[PDB]
A paper describes a structure:
Defense-associated sirtuin 2 (DSR2) systems are widely distributed across prokaryotic genomes, providing robust protection against phage infection. DSR2 recognizes phage tail tube proteins and induces abortive infection by depleting intracellular NAD+, a process that is counteracted by another phage-encoded protein, DSR Anti Defense 1 (DSAD1). Each DSR2 protomer consists of a conserved N-terminal Sirtuin (SIR2) domain, a C-terminal domain (CTD) and a middle domain (MD). DSR2 assembles into an elongated tetramer, with four NADase catalytic modules clustered in the center and the regulatory-sensing modules distributed at four distal corners.
To understand the structural basis of DSR2 anti-phage defense, we expressed the full-length Bacillus subtilis DSR2 protein in Escherichia coli BL21 and determined the cryo-EM structure at 4.15 Å. This structure is referred to as the apo DSR2 tetramer to distinguish it from the complex with the Tube protein (activator) and the DSAD1 (inhibitor) bound structures reported later. In this structure, four DSR2 subunits assemble into an autoinhibited homo-tetrameric assembly, forming a ~ 480 kDa bone-shaped supramolecular complex. Two DSR2 subunits first cross over to form an X-shaped dimer, mediated by the SIR2 and MD domains. The tetramer is then assembled by arranging two such dimers in a head-to-head orientation, facilitated by the SIR2 domain. The DSR2W143G/Y148G/Y552G/V556S/F559G/N563S mutant with disruption at the dimeric interface behaves as a monomer, whereas the DSR2I259S/Y260G mutant with disruption at the tetrameric interface behaves as a dimer. As expected, in the absence of activator binding, DSR2 showed no detectable in vitro NADase activity. The same arrangement and similar active sites of the SIR2 domains in the apo DSR2 tetramer and inactive ThsA suggest that the apo form of DSR2 represents the inactive conformation of the DSR2 complex. In contrast to the “loose” structure of the apo DSR2 tetramer (~256 Å in diameter), the DSR2H171A-Tube tetramer shows a more compact structure (~226 Å in diameter). Without phage infection, the apo DSR2 tetramer in cells adopts an inactive, loose conformation with its N-terminal SIR2 domain in a self-suppressed state.
Author numbering:
A (entry chain A): 4 to 1005
B (entry chain E): 15 to 637, 642 to 895, 897 to 1005
Amino acid sequence: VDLESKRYGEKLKEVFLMLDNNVVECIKEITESSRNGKLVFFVGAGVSTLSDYPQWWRLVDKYHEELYGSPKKGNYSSDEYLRIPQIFYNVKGEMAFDGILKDFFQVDKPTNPIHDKILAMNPAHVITTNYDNLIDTACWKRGKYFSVISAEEDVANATSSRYLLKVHGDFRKGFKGENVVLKEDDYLNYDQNYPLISNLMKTIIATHTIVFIGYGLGDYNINMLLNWVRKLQKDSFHKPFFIRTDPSPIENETLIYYENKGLRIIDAASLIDSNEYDYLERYSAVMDLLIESQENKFITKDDEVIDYIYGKISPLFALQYIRKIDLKHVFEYDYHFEVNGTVVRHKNKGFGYMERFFELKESCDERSKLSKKQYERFNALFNFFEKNGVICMAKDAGTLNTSIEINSLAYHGKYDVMKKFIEEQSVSIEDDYKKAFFLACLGRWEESYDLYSNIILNSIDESNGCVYYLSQINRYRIYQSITQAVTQFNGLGLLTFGRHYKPFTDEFLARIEREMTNFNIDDLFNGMPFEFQKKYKILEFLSDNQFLYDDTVKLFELTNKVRSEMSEGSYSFGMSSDIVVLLRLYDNLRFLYENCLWSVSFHEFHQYIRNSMSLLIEKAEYERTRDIDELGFSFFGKKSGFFMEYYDFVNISRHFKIDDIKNLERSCSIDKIRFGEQEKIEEYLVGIAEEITKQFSANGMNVVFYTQFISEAKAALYFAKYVKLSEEGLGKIVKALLFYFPERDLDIGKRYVWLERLTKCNELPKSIISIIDDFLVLQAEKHIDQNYSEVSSNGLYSRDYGALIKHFEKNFISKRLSEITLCLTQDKQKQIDFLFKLLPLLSTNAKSHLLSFKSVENINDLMNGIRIGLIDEFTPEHEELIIEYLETRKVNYIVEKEKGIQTFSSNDYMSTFGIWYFLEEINNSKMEEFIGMDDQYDFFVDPENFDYKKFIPSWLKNYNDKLLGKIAGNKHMKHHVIEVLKERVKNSNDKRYLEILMNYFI
Amino acid sequence: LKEVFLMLDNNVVECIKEITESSRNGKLVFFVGAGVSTLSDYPQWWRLVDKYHEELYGSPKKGNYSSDEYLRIPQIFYNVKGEMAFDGILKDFFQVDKPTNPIHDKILAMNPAHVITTNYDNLIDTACWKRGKYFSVISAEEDVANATSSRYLLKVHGDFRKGFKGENVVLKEDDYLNYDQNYPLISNLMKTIIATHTIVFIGYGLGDYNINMLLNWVRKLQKDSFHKPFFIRTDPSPIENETLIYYENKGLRIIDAASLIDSNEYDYLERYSAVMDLLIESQENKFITKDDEVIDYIYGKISPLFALQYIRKIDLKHVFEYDYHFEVNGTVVRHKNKGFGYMERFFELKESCDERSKLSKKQYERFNALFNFFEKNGVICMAKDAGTLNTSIEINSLAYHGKYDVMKKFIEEQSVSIEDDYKKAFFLACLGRWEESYDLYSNIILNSIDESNGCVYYLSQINRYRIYQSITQAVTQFNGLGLLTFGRHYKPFTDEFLARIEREMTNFNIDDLFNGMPFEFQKKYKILEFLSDNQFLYDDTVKLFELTNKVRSEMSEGSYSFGMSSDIVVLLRLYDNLRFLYENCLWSVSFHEFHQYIRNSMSLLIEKAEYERTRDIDELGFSKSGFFMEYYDFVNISRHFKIDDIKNLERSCSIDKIRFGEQEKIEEYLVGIAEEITKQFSANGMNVVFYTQFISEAKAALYFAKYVKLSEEGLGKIVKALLFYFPERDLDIGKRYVWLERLTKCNELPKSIISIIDDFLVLQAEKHIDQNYSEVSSNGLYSRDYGALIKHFEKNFISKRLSEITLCLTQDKQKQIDFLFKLLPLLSTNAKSHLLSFKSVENINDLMNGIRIGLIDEFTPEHEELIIEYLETRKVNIVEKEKGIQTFSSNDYMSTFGIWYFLEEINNSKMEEFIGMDDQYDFFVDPENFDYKKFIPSWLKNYNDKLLGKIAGNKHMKHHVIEVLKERVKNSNDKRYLEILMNYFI
């Protein structure tokens, strides 16, 4: 029945079952040639009769009609077919011939389905013998582009790589018989008149498998080609195939003779009985057999149910750990794989081979029927499939529990084992390539390039050649890498390096420039063995810089497409299952194709993958803080998802930068984000500590290695505040943090800030304190030279640098520093000032010995003591000393009033003077008679009578030391004061005012 | 080099250009001889023939070996001794190793397509290992069908790689005379290769028999259509002209080495190095030294595609091999150009007409065409001497503006030009989601292949494929949910369309279209590869739109005086998006999964940049950008955003304080959309295929207000769109009320709008009088809200449409008159008196309505006792058994009860006898003991008067009530929380 595979389905399956060996092997060869892109068709004129095109015998009958007046009775002789027009051309002239041709050919007919049927079989080249554009129009409307060749200049002006030859020429240049082979003299002088076309046809016969179609035995062209081919050794010639839809069965003797001639005959009459006029039916039946040959994978006890997949997957065994999504390209999108491991039959027609493969896989029984070789193939394929992580059929879903593991030592950074594995002797070529990739990203790119050259020297012997492609790609990429490396080194100059660390002598630069010049990377795209090209098609995007450039675009689009829903704080229900963040994490962890890569972290644009995916994972806090601003459910615990593991920590340390970490923590609560694996991360941090300790203990030619490892420490240590280190590793991490980091990279201020954050996150009971004291002592002997100074980004203060230690232990005194103080004299004033910084942690004897050095003789020295903290509470003698100056300021205030200006920008001590009186540090009534000098003095000395017309909330920037907390309970007019804050908050967008509106208000 | 090049102007400078062009296209093919072997010091043939002469004749060659003597003399030996002597002699003279000369390496460096070596050797074969190039070697006919790779290394006379025996190589004259018979499969291949490729002879004998046969063949059959080959003459003595002109008439051109350099006779290496170095330049720099260079090397590259009106700025960087950085602003600068500054020359020649006068007339016209093309795209000057490049962005396409009547007018009109047919097809795709004639694209295909214009077939195929995908997606949407969503099985597409499109689109070559297109299409229009594969492809969708992620990370600004608005944020974020709005105004925007969304990622940072510049400087009026959002950006916002997007924008961004430009244009656009939706409500049926998305646009316009002052008529028309013209499925009564309240709330509500609202109420009353229809409000907004909205903004609002119905009521049913019962305060005095006489108020709903509007707030003890009895019924509903009866969200009146408490709307404290079941709302009777998060901040910002002048927290719960508000404002982002904090009390 029509529109159903009845004559196309079961009966053709039975016919294929009863087919002989010759026909089935011809079908297999045809399918192989088609799938290899090495198939060329030879279209005859017979199919033209299927479209009701005018026939040549009709034309010659016409010519005889107007030649002798009456047509010749009976069937015309074959020779006359090429003889009657010639005489007609000799005497009647050209005009009658042209008129008849234009009368009988200026018509158009629709294209028969056989045209597109043969066209939809990826034919590389098509050789025709006709006088129209029926096949041209068919491939035209189908969409395929073919370059029509019918003249010598057409051969000369070649434009594409798909040829549609015209053995006798078309009628593009007019309806003239001179340019179209139609006469016997043309058949005699074809070689002389058209040498180029003939030579091209002879060349194209040998290179491909010629499949004749729409031809009858005895035609002149076929006989001529057979005569040509018989004048050959035929030692390595491929016998062409023939299609012949005769209504009557073929005699066996003729079959034997033509098989001996060198043609393999496929008969359509022997297929099924049909009417003598059903040529279209026979042609369509042949087409349907050769098309159904695709989805003709019948299943038996011993069959291709494992062999087909074995053939499809066998080349891929060379690679270590391929991606799940890439498999969709292997199976020509017959299925669609999921990152979870399920496989769904989408966009598939025919037989579900994957389903039967599964049914064999899970079922222990019903498998002994397979052959032992098939059993081994099944075992190998099952091992490969279980290695990748494909779980089961999409129908048999559930219990989706999977993890991610990486085996490369580069990921974990075991540099000791790294080098240890580096030294040993070579064994084979694969381990040489692996150790060559290992040799890079370590600071010895010279030897890495040399080993890549050595591998590429003798890699053609490889059975698969994938190692050849990978080595070539890595060589190209390392060439660019060293190019930009030397460019950046020239750009930095001596600013970054104390001495310009040239990676290598310019001779190597010259030889690599000569080697790598004019090297456009095409490889598989244009030239590489066709056997490799038909397979391994998933490595086609490797021609770019990174090993995933073309495959990163889908992630770039999909991250936004899924941010369309995972990043919006309006909804508060909370997604239950099929969490998009988990599948995004699975997808990006799948991209850790670390078994076979090159310097993916080096590519600045590659790490953006990590720099964006985890960023959006954290920006998914919109799903958090839900049901807190909304009713929602009863769960009011601010605990988001993303239970990050060791791998997430490693990725954040590897790719995220310190500034980006600050940006993300500006608007997140990772402090509240919980995470497991409290022990492995400690080991990773410790290993980083020994690596940085060994590197900086005796620095050498590690500048190439000292470009990414240095950035690793910044990300690792700063982020480590979130995790809770054990006290045992805290000592090692502090030792690494303090002594062994470079001084230029980290000043005192940043080291102090990071030390403060680790101390706040994890306490320091007794052990780390000794290390801090030792560092303080070492700084003390550093300050021996007065000329010695250090640059601080945020502050050179050592007050807090030691006040932190005093905070840990109130009763703390440094005995070693005490003796250091005791063994000094009044010659090194900078050392005296530094010991002044260290006064709280010094012993009483040290204080007594040091105070004999410097003292307060004037007021300014007394306030200079306030700057350094010499005298926390000065004696009443110093109180009245200020009063004498305050009286001196008082009498000069009248003089300054007469001057017409107020000089309070410098010596702004009255604001400080009123601080102590307001702090109740000084209890005297003398200061009140000096009222009115300064607005700050008014606001502190007499807060109950001051005038707030000054309107200066900007002082709140410097009221951290004012101890606003004490004032908060001591403001005489809190209500008047807060109205300023309300106005300032409304009329200013600064956040400092918002801080005071909280730290010390409501 | 250049010093010698000064005189290289005699059919040499153009020959180098032609050879380099052939190399670029891959048509270049070498043909190496025996000279390179001599450079590698390979054994010479004359030594072998001298040895053979000594073997038989005796004594060395007293005379000289003639041409024939070089061939027949060994053959005679073959006729007197067996092949073992030949094998021994060849082994003695050939079992040697020779170093690979640099000539082989440089020959590989020029990267040819095919190599044809006539000499028997492995030096060139071995040299491929060092470069790594892979070649398939063809020794003879035995290995032809085993074509390993496209690259070929053909051995004309075989080789001694397996040529230990004498039969594997042809050297004797007997083999030469019957060479074709012995090796037929090689001669034809050589002929077709030299016919279909550019062939260059290097280091090759001029008088050799092989070139003799070649020449006697090529000019014998071909006269004028043959491309003349290239030959390199490397001889010490300089060549003369009579032989040269004789060879030119033969059909072969000559490039001698003597003209270039004449260092020494023996320094063949020097001559070969010079002649190859003259080609090493590869036509990448200093190819020509003439003037008027702004007419060549650019015109053939910058204007083969001028049929496309618009070109993106980022595209021109790919056009010129990234030699210049084309900024989004419109300036350029050299990046990788190494030579003459042709762009610099063009910029200099643009203005100075004095030096333009000397330009050739046709060259002048081409220069003016290039100038017009550049100024149309937006390139005006160079980054070296240019400042700001802020320019108004405009669109010429009518689809992006929203015109529809002229759209139909053009659709009715026929189109003759192929471009006009493309425009018509695009416009039809705009009007109808599925083209009733997608065969218009087939006509585009056939006409484009008919014509020689090109670059129309390629685009139309992509458009057709995208249309196919969209139609299949529409079919998927029209699943079982589609039938109920649209009311019934509409099935706009019929089955035969699917049947034909599935059979046409099957096995489509979406992998790549450049393979189908010839080489010239791929090379010239390489700029179309951005959307060619379009299989989630790059640099057309997100690759430059992923750059905004970096700015998203660069959002953080130090201190307070930085600015994300008065900055370069317009560069690469605003102008980049505006440039990428249309690439050619004809590409199908039909796909909406990514583009319309990523349009809301844009216009998002810009909106967040509207922080009123309060932190940029002290005064919010910074006084520049201005950010007057003109109508194009308004269209973007009202086209690509959703309801919830704009909702969360209004949550924590400036909305009303921002002013938009082109307000009259916005008025025109809104009036047009309202008029066309009203017409289409009557013009046709659902036409869901266009309706489904289009209504979204309408919605995005209605709730986007408080921006323009609507004209009296237009507002009257736009509110008329709400007069039962919008489908009630999308907008119920509650949503209509909300959007109506949002509109005009900043206006004074003229009397025409009041009459329109009264008419709406009249139609709703007619619907209610049906006695069967029941009001449907998802948000609980009853029809009385319109009555509450009116008369609360105006006075003396009274209508004669419905009061007469109340007076002339037949006292039939209360259900159909519940609308009038609720609207009692708006009713006429006599009518309301009659209605009051007809129906009293006793039910809890009646009491709620009476307190809400009309009647009286305080009530008799029996009424509050009835409310207590309702509370007792809620007490019984004890029988909940945790089966959903405990949920009380559907009936929202328990909280309303507590609203009367704490507001002195009670006569006794009997509610204390009923413990509040609503855990959300119970603290009104037990303020001291409240459940954790009893008060949800959403409910906190809901009401406005229960603060009652801040006494809500002043009477009790003074402290630990601002903690929740403050932590909400600290973590979340809402202005309402800040205002609640400002009043300091709940």
